[PDB]
Amino acid sequence: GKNIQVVVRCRPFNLAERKASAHSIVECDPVRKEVSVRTGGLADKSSRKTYTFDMVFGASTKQIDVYRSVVCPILDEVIMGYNCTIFAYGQTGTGKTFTMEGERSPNEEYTWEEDPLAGIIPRTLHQIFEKLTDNGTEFSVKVSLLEIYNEELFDLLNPSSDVSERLQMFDDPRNKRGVIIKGLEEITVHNKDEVYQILEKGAAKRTTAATLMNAYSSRSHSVFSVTIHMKEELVKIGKLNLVDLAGSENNINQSLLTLGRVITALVERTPHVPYRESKLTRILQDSLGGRTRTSIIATISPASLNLEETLSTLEYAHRAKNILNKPE
């Protein structure tokens, strides 16, 4: 009996916004875990909409704070042999990818292990090896990376040199809420020093996919899966899904569209839940009311221009707090 945990992260003003003299309409209070939105513009200076969350990160939050506070507890439950999912949800430009992946600091000032701008994926891989090596247990780590665009499936770590070769998806007859990704390459990570070269190749395939399909970065969903096998004889198996969704400001929007419908259906206790109607909600079905521990990172902008999309994100995120999973 475990509810889905949801956090909110507000980014600082960007440069376009500073030049346009944007006003803030967001107040993020981490102590009381509240986000408050100024909704009345020039007409009603006093009206607000306020939501309470499991945690709230204001503009000044460092990447390392997201990792320590959110990723470590989940990583520990993966090392204990459970299934866990984290996805970033919010409008384009609000920090979904900065949170899940991060950036490299310019001028080559840092190693990739120490860069303060790295996000969840690079820290998770480095720290899995740190925790288990010189910890006394036998383990193998494998990772995969598929992407969803226009309800087609692409393998961004595949040995094939053409990124456009499509994957295919079938119900898993071994697990009642799972899928099989026919064709998906799973690459073994032998140690921490292999982590960066694997990311490099996936980044290169992503760049080429951008030249082939319209608005690729913002209309595709990203699913980075790491699986851990541990032998202590007692052998546990953990799996962690790290998902970066497409922009929530929306043929093409089918997974995003269904995802809301699926959420509304679970929290309204409707009988039939339309998991089957999109590729995304099929992959994530054990993560939306199944037996997987799930956490949502909802990203938003402080600027007045984005009032409607900020409200839309908060309401979707707040409503998903009412969904229960039953992990292992």
Ligand X SMILES: Nc1ncnc2c1ncn2[C@@H]1O[C@H](COP(=O)(O)OP(=O)(O)O)[C@@H](O)[C@H]1O
Q: Which residue has the tokens 């376009």?
A: 16
Q: Is 16 in the site for ligand GCE (CB under 6 A)?
A: no
In the complex with ligand GCE, the residue whose CB is nearer, 103 or 171, is 103
Length of the chain equals 328
- Using CB under 5 A, pick the residue from 63, 85, 97, 285 that binds Mg ion: 97
Does 95 count as an annotated binding residue? yes
In the complex with ligand X, the residue whose CB is nearer, 247 or 289, is 247
Q: How many residues bind ligand GCE (CB under 6 A)?
A: 18
Does 91 count as an annotated binding residue? yes
Q: How far apart are the first and last CA of the chain?
A: 10
**In the stretch 87-116, what mask flags binding to ligand GCE with x, by CB under 6 A?**
----------x---xxxx-------x--x-
**For residue 9, what are the CA distances in angstroms to 26, 102, 241, 299, 302?**
11, 14, 20, 5, 10
- Beta carbons within 10 angstroms of residue 55's beta carbon: 17
The residue at minimum Cβ distance from ligand X is 95
The residue at minimum Cβ distance from Mg ion is 97
In the complex with ligand GCE, the residue whose CB is nearer, 4 or 143, is 143
3-state secondary structure of 252: coil
What are the residues binding ligand X (CB under 6 A)? 11-12, 14, 90, 92-98, 299
CB of residue 108 vs ligand X: minimum separation in angstroms? Answer: 18
Does 40 count as an annotated binding residue? no
Q: Is 238 in the site for ligand GCE (CB under 6 A)?
A: no
Sign of CA dihedral 273, 276, 278, 283: positive
Q: How far apart are CA 97 and CA 13, in angstroms?
A: 16
Q: Which residues contact 176 (CB under 8 A, 6 or more apart)?
A: none
User: Which residues bind to Mg ion, rule: CB under 5 A?
Assistant: 97, 217
* Binding-site annotation: residue ranges for ATP: 90-97
